[PDB]
Amino acid sequence: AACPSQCSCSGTTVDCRSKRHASVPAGIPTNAQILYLHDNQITKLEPGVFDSLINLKELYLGSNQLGALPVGVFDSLTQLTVLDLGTNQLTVLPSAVFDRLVHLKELFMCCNKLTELPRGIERLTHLTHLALDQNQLKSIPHGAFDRLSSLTHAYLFGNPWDCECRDIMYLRNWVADHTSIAMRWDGKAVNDPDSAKCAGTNTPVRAVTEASTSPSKCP
């Protein structure tokens, strides 16, 4: 199998994990279906880097040093079912970055510096797994999970949820109403609807009473 240096390839799998890559390898085989780039030292993605990988189904970019995604970086990846961006340095994502990714089933974004739910995620109707843990989220916009009707795993822990602000009630009610899909991480997925906790009080978000919140406490 054609294969870049410091990767191992078999079939349509290109495995470049844990090989000290400082950049995405050149010449990634265009027939690739699974691409492991996780646990490297990749500090950026060049615009258009994945444009040729039209058959790609799974892309793992976790545990790198990414601070941004190029506009349209995943647009060619219409067959993509798994995307892992966890453990990077992402702050804000391009608004349209998920617009062509309706086939996506698993989207992992823990352990970044996200302060809002990225735009577009609410339209990814096929998601079964969505990981937002250990970011800087304070709330979830009203209705944002309403069409994610296939979800089985939602990771929301490790965020400083602002339980004083009335905007938290959407998430409060959502967690309360979907207890079976709220997951914590004990080195594995463990169902725990108390795992999303209020900033400061470290009380469960789902237990928050409407009356304890206020629409005047929403910076």
Ligand SMILES: CC(=O)N[C@@H]1[C@@H](O)[C@H](O[C@@H]2O[C@H](CO)[C@H](O)[C@H](O)[C@H]2O[C@@H]2O[C@@H](C)[C@@H](O)[C@@H](O)[C@@H]2O)[C@@H](CO)O[C@@H]1O
């Ligand atoms: C290629 C691959 O499978 N990578 C996985 C990676 O996604 C895992 O990260 C965990 O993902 C889940 C969602 O499925 C939760 O978001 C976990 O919090 C997350 O783990 C976090 O990152 C890892 C690297 C550790 O630091 C962990 O302690 C954090 O909570 C990891 C889990 O080990 O396996 C992979 O590398």
